[PDB]
């Protein structure tokens, strides 16, 4: 078994990619993840349609905006 909350707590510092529901993605080191599924990453790169678009640095994504979050 693997609950999503220890999976999000153990993914702190590792480079993860959070894909939103609008097709965009943010790849960066996960820094903060609370119980309300709020993500906060540092040195994040925002990509659109599989191609890198920009570098936002520190970013904060809510729970109802990120569709999925995978490891990279």
């Amino acid at each position: 078994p693997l609950n999503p909350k220890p999976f999000l707590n153990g993914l702190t510092g590792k480079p993860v990619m959070v894909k939103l529901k609008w097709g965009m993605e943010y790849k960066g080191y996960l820094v903060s993840v609370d119980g309300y599924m709020n993500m906060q990453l540092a040195n994040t790169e925002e990509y659109i349609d599989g191609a890198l678009s920009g570098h936002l640095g520190e970013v904060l994504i809510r729970c109802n905006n990120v569709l999925y979050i995978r490891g990279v």
């Binding site: 939103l20 943010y26 609370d34 906060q40 936002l56 970013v59 994504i61």
Partner: protein
């Protein structure tokens, strides 16, 4: 009470909204994305647990197609934004 307020202060200082706590510490401008593809860059005066922000001297830019779309922007003195439309909040913008 006092313990719940201390827990809320700890969750605001060390949680996901700690970058928002950077907006009220050194008064730095943050860029928040909306649901209507309108990015608002500005300082955040007040925040909450439901991501409701109070922006002061904010600039809202978006893309409107008339051809090629133009970058029509506006400047608001004081504004309030609910947390339901907030998609992504960047602490340190590029420009």
């Amino acid at each position: 009470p006092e313990e719940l307020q201390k827990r809320e202060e700890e969750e605001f200082n060390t949680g996901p909204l700690s970058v928002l706590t950077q907006s009220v510490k050194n008064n730095t401008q943050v860029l928040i994305n909306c649901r209507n593809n309108k990015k608002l860059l500005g300082r955040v005066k007040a925040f909450d647990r439901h991501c409701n922000m109070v922006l002061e001297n904010v600039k809202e830019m978006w893309t409107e197609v008339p051809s090629k779309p133009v970058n029509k922007d506006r400047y608001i003195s004081k504004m309030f934004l609910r947390g339901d439309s907030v998609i992504v909040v960047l602490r340190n913008p590029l420009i």
